[PDB]
From a paper:
IL‐6 is a cytokine exerting both immunostimulating and regenerating effects depending on the localization of the IL‐6 receptor. In vivo, IL‐6 is mainly targeted to the liver but can also be complexed by a soluble, circulating IL‐6 receptor. Although many of the biological effects of the human cytokine interleukin 6 (IL‐6) have been studied in detail, little is known about the influence of the glycans present on this glycoprotein. A library of glycoforms of human interleukin 6 (IL‐6) comprising complex and mannosidic N‐glycans was generated by semisynthesis.
We also attempted to crystallize a synthetic IL‐6 glycoform and started with IL‐61. The crystallization of an IL‐6 glycoform with a full‐length N‐glycan (data not shown) was not successful. The structure of IL‐61 (GlcNAc) did not resolve the flexible loop beyond Glu 50 (Ser 51‐Asn 59) but refinement to 2.0 Å showed low electron density for the GlcNAc residue indicating connectivity at the side chain amide. Notably, in both structures the unstructured loop region ends at Asn 60. In segment B the N‐terminal cysteine was protected by a mixed disulfide and the native methionine at position 48 was replaced with a norleucine, thus preventing undesired oxidation. The three segments were connected by sequential native chemical ligation followed by two‐step refolding. The glycoforms were characterized by LC‐MS, HR‐MS, SDS‐PAGE and CD‐spectroscopy indicating that the correct fold was attained and the formation of the disulfides was complete. The native helical fold of the set of IL‐6 glycoforms was independent of the glycan and only the overall intensity of the spectra varied to a small extent. The resulting hIL‐6 glycoproteins were of high‐purity and were properly folded according to CD‐spectroscopy, LC‐MS, HR‐MS and X‐ray crystallography (one structure). Despite the variations in the sugar part the activity of the individual glycoforms was nearly identical in the cellular assays indicating that the binding to the IL‐6 receptor and the formation of the signal‐transducing receptor complex should not be significantly affected by the various N‐glycan structures.
Residue numbers in the entry: 16 to 50, 60 to 183
The structure:
């Protein structure tokens, strides 16, 4: 029995969570404090929770949110000299996931693309913080991205 489109998405999310787990271990090892910021987050109106569950509004939110996360994953790869390959694997893994999800939504279309030139300003603002605030930013991106993916996986199984 070959993987269905749903099973492939489900596996790809668990695969990226295993990667975030591995990239957290390298960025925490490297941090000298380990071992404002508006990151995508599910709310009840997005239709991804059991209360107010709405399959179509939910799938649009998952895709919109992953697209909004890409500049943060570029921030991680641009920073992690040592964890270079691992951070790039997470970016490219997230790109394949977005492609699987866009095939599922091919019936819906539209979707809010983030503005490129706002994302290039965000990037510069993030890279000009002192090392403390950049280590905090890294932690908050990895935590928030993990929580988005777990919420996405729960919603996708309820479809």
């Amino acid at each position: 029995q070959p993987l269905t489109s749903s099973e492939r998405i489900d596996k790809q999310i668990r695969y990226i969570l295993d990667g975030i787990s591995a990239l957290r271990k390298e960025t925490c090892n490297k941090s000298n404090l380990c071992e404002n910021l508006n990151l995508p987050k599910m709310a009840e109106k997005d239709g991804c929770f059991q209360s107010g569950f709405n399959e179509e509004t939910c799938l649009v939110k998952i895709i919109t949110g992953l697209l909004e996360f890409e500049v943060y994953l570029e921030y991680l790869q641009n920073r992690f000299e040592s964890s270079e390959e691992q951070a790039r694997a997470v970016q490219m893994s997230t790109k394949v996931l977005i492609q699987f999800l866009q095939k599922k939504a091919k019936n819906l279309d539209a979707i809010t693309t983030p503005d490129p030139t706002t994302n290039a300003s965000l990037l510069t603002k993030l890279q000009a913080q002192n090392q403390w605030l950049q280590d905090m930013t890294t932690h908050l991106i990895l935590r928030s991205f993990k929580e988005f993916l777990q919420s996405s996986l729960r919603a996708l199984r309820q479809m």
